């Protein structure tokens, strides 16, 4: 690991995690991907319900916008992950090179990017600005919309789950616990979800 990278990821975790708080607070509705919403100033609904980019505007305005115009949007909470981590990847680039490295954008889950060098790798010790995944094994099958939760991790053992709020992961465990059939509880999976660091550490802002 090279010093520019080590300092890079801690300064973006820092960003993953405003990212969080500013969803977290923001309008922005839980809707299944069947009824998910987003400005047509910036993007066009896709026919699995993703968000795609207009052709013709910047992606940072539009990502901003997710932010601006929380109140025209509802998505999956797979989906906020990517918009947590997109938004704090415009506030840790040039956005320059955000406009042009992400400019078909697609947002519908962390699997469908490419842009970012999403990795999961098995691991308990996760760190702030993290993704964790809570398995609710046990689900209602009336309500398939708690399978499951996509989360942040924020420090201080709060986590960030967009349709939930900020919680600990006790809470988060037990608000799933219900939506179920159950023998098995909702529990946290033993894998770690993250961007690429080093390679998005070459469009650093110089500060």
Request: glycine share 6%; charged share 20%; with cysteine.
């Amino acid at each position: 690991p090279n010093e520019q990278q080590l300092l890079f990821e801690i300064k973006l975790r820092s960003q993953i995690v405003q990212a969080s708080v500013d969803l977290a607070k923001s309008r922005a509705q839980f809707a299944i991907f069947r009824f998910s919403r987003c400005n047509s100033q910036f993007w066009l609904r896709d026919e699995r319900g993703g968000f795609q980019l207009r052709p013709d505007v910047l992606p940072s305005d539009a990502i901003n916008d997710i932010f601006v115009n929380s109140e025209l949007y509802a998505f999956e909470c797979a989906t906020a992950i990517v918009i947590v981590f997109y938004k704090a990847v415009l506030e840790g680039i040039d956005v320059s090179a955000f406009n042009r490295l992400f400019a078909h954008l697609l947002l519908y889950d962390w699997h469908t990017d490419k842009d970012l060098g999403i990795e999961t790798k098995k691991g308990e010790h996760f760190l702030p600005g993290d993704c964790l995944y809570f398995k609710n094994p046990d689900v209602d099958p009336l309500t398939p919309q708690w399978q499951g939760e996509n989360t942040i991790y924020l420090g201080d053992g709060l986590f960030y789950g967009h349709g939930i709020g900020i919680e600990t992961a006790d809470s988060i465990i037990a608000a799933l616990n219900r939506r179920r059939k159950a023998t098995k509880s909702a529990y946290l999976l033993p894998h770690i979800t993250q961007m690429n660091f080093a390679y998005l550490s070459q469009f650093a802002r110089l500060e």
